[PDB]
Amino acid sequence: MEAAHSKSTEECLAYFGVSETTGLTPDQVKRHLEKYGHNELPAEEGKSLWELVIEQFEDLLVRILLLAACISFVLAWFEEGEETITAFVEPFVILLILIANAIVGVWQERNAENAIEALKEYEPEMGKVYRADRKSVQRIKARDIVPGDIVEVAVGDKVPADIRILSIKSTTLRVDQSILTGESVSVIKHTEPVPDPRAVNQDKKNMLFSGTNIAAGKALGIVATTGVSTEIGKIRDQMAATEQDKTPLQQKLDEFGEQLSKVISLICVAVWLINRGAIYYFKIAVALAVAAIPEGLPAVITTCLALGTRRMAKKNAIVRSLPSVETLGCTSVICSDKTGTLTTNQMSVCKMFIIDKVDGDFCSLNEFSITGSTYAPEGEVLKNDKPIRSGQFDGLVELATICALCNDSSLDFNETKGVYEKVGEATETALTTLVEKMNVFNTEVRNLSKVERANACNSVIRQLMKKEFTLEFSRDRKSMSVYCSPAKSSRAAVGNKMFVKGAPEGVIDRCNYVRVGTTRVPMTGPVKEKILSVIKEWGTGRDTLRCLALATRDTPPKREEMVLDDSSRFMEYETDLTFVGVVGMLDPPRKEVMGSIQLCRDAGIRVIMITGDNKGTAIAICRRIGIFGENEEVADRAYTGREFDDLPLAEQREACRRACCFARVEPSHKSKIVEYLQSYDEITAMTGDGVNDAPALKKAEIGIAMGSGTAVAKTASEMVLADDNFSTIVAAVEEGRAIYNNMKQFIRYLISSNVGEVVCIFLTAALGLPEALIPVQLLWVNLVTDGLPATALGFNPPDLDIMDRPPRSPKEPLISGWLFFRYMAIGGYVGAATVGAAAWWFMYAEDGPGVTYHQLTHFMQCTEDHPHFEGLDCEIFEAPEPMTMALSVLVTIEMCNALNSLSENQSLMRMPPWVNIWLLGSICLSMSLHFLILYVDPLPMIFKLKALDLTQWLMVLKISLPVIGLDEILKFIARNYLEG
Ligand SMILES: CC(=O)C1=C(O)N2[C@H](C1=O)[C@H]1c3c[nH]c4cccc(c34)C[C@H]1C2(C)C
Ligand SMILES: [Mg+2]
Ligand code: NA
């Protein structure tokens, strides 16, 4: 049944044709079970590290290396009757590299624990129904509940399905809807229809929502919807939105990988358009692929990311997904939940007042303030910002007495967590904490164990008066009371009191006196007017507190005369009251939240509050934390979920750009707001702690959960602030930007090597030259000998002005303009210095001089034309030395390039090459690995190399060194005649 909240109880009963007193027949159940299915959310699996690996080869860049590996495997099989001992190394290294990258890519996006499994934790396994075949309440599996049957819920129950309330059997039914609202405050349900067909969960006080729980009361209802058609079902559908997405940097990478693939298959149409019977293509096409691809990038990327995570862990931020450690770096909008995120989610009494003195039209109040933002009994009472003893004011003694006695909650020290927690409602525990701070009888608490300290002062008060019974809360009275007698008195004794608490208006009207110290005087208009004026100010400004009036009936009726089983009589028992005091409470901001907001603003980041709580307290908090100015007007800048649902699509979309405060919202509203923000192509984050935050946390580019929040929120996030420090979000942005800067410079360095290896192989094929470099070599170059210095570049002490500019545009490309022209040209000098030396050992070299008129081009004719312009041998092109001189030049050039990459524009004259010790130590590790291929006996075979002379290396150290000057020329023109 749709819109059950908008219908009446009989209308709902009619709709399914059941009686409140027999329920469905097993016939009706079978039919409904068939038509609607079972009462449960479908599980979401999460794929396996098989088809996750399969999805690794799913992109074009590695689709190239897999195709190439097969062609390389064909080349390794059809080997001549020569070096067949280890010619398969080429294809088998590539194939290992692919699987090695495949495993590295999956592992960084970790965590097998499911968000939906955590969500089904809110499904009860058992439910309670009245069905036709039995008189007594049946207890069946919750998954067998069907729309239409009569369900019963009571104290401590998880609600089994979305239910329309039929009759409430207690004086009140109190509900905890925090999974839909993020607020623990118990909600007071009724049975009257809620006409508005677009009412929001908070407005549907005649409904029970599945997965929520019963704080107090007993109720009977009819099931409206089950399974996936519930409010928690909506949350679930948005968790299954596994529409495979990636971070803004990964997309830039994927796009860069797609631009790089349209280079390889563009040089193949270039190579082909220069000229069995074609083994020359499938030999050099493989060399083109291996060359262009900077394989090992993942390794050096992963590492950069890995050290960011590990660095972030020391700041108490746990990054559940490696790439996300950078995301906040380029975030323009941070959406944030309020309760438990921006605030502590610990209701606190921050102000209170009693009457000072009364005189005709003059009335003055003793106002006090109370510090402490937690449930811990630590804090102090101040008058005019100076400390006082609460026990000196008799009115505060009664204030505490009322708060301690008119209370069904208490405080508990959790020894495993080392913190104080509530037991019962937050608003009542605030009263418990208040009473322990006040300590109005000067009980000695300094030396109590923390567990005894929790309720010490409340216990003292409980020793003085015996609570005989509570006139529980009722809707028509908006207040509650407790009937108490002086302990150590007889049933008959006078001195009984009623202690009342409730909504200021109603309570105050039922007062005929005001307490002054231990005296009492008539309530008058001027006195009432004074009281009401401060209650009004306290609950509307930037205070906007929640105020309770506290009163006592000095002469309550005799127990006997009071009829307890009839609550409509409770109001009149609570009359002829004496006003005592007011308390004002709010759930307070975390102390570091304000600072964090300002620093984000300074980094050009927007902060938006999206909360299930109410607009008035949403706005007040926004002012406290700096999202709004204290006096700034916000009519068009703050909205409720329902106001938002009234705006047409375009207006809603614009609202997300204009507004900063969204209140009384539903889980879907949060993801909708994030969705809109993303339609302006803004990189947006979400911060939260509740189940109601999950949808939004998932849809964001990065979801950030609070350490002390819910498991659902945590499993939907990529980052958890274990200690609940909002400051860490600022530090996260800094680290995130440092990461992007690192990648920006080590991609330049590696691709520089890559473009050089491409041009080299484009010349040893268009100039018909002898094989300059081989695939087998390049794989060791790009993964091991180039990877190390690239990984060493990540040990850069970050820029000191990285947090002062705004976030980079999403459309801003990794490398473009001058940087392309830069590495593109360096990739040309390398592509000609490796070709040069490989040809130079064949000409101007004494250890094998060929025809020095460029007649090296013809290697086509060895035994084919030996009587031609020859002079000597045949097996001299496949010599190790040309490849050795080509390799050693490639390697040595990049070692300078590594020293060149220490700065983007500052010269090595102005920035010493001994800044990074990890880089220098990496060049040694590169060298001692490069010379390890030469001297170590079994290695020089596969990589076909041989060590050189003192002069041989001196020609290397003369064709590589003048790369510094080439880059220096690019540095001068950039820093001067370009910009700056
Ligand atoms: C099998 C496997 O998991 C993978 C790989 O083995 N890789 C990456 C890759 O995803 C490849 C890649 C995708 N997009 C880009 C952009 C830039 C560079 C690269 C890539 C290198 C590719 C490689 C080989 C590192
Ligand atoms: Mg919250
Ligand atoms: Na996401």
Curated annotation (Swiss-Prot):
A single GO cellular-component term on record: membrane
Pfam families noted in UniProt: Cation_ATPase (PF13246), Cation_ATPase_C (PF00689), Cation_ATPase_N (PF00690), E1-E2_ATPase (PF00122), Hydrolase (PF00702)
Transmembrane segments: 49-69, 90-110, 254-273, 282-299, 744-763, 774-794, 815-837, 884-903, 917-935, 951-971
Location in or out of the cell: Endoplasmic reticulum membrane; Sarcoplasmic reticulum membrane
Lumenal side: 70-89, 764-773, 838-883, 936-950
Cytoplasmic side: 1-48, 111-253, 300-743, 795-814, 904-916
Membrane topology: Multi-pass membrane protein
Cofactor(s) needed by this chain: Mg(2+)
Amino-acid positions noted as binding Ca(2+) 1 in the UniProt annotation, renumbered to this chain: 290-291, 293, 295, 782, 786
Residues annotated with Phosphothreonine modification: 427, 555
Effect of substituting residue 862 to A: Loss of ATP-dependent Ca(2+)transport
Activity control summary: Inhibited by sarcolipin (SLN) and myoregulin (MRLN). Has also been shown to be reversibly inhibited by phospholamban (PLN) at low calcium concentrations in vitro. Dephosphorylated PLN decreases the apparent affinity of the ATPase for calcium and this inhibition is regulated by the phosphorylation of PLN in vitro. Enhanced by DWORF; DWORF increases activity by displacing sarcolipin (SLN), phospholamban (PLN) and myoregulin (MRLN).
Tissue specificity field: Skeletal muscle (at protein level). Skeletal muscle, fast twitch muscle (type II) fibers.
Keywords: ATP-binding, Calcium, Calcium transport, Disulfide bond, Endoplasmic reticulum, Ion transport, Magnesium, Membrane, Metal-binding, Nucleotide-binding, Phosphoprotein, Sarcoplasmic reticulum, Translocase, Transmembrane, Transmembrane helix, Transport
Positions that bind ATP: 339, 428, 475, 501, 546, 611-613, 664, 670, 692
Domain notes: Ca(2+) and ATP binding cause major rearrangements of the cytoplasmic and transmembrane domains. According to the E1-E2 model, Ca(2+) binding to the cytosolic domain of the pump in the high-affinity E1 conformation is followed by the ATP-dependent phosphorylation of the active site Asp, giving rise to E1P. A conformational change of the phosphoenzyme gives rise to the low-affinity E2P state that exposes the Ca(2+) ions to the lumenal side and promotes Ca(2+) release. Dephosphorylation of the active site Asp mediates the subsequent return to the E1 conformation. PLN and SLN both have a single transmembrane helix; both occupy a similar binding site on ATP2A1 that is situated between the ATP2A1 transmembrane helices.
Family affiliation: Belongs to the cation transport ATPase (P-type) (TC 3.A.3) family. Type IIA subfamily.
Protein name: Sarcoplasmic/endoplasmic reticulum calcium ATPase 1
Species name: Oryctolagus cuniculus (Rabbit)
Gene behind the chain: ATP2A1
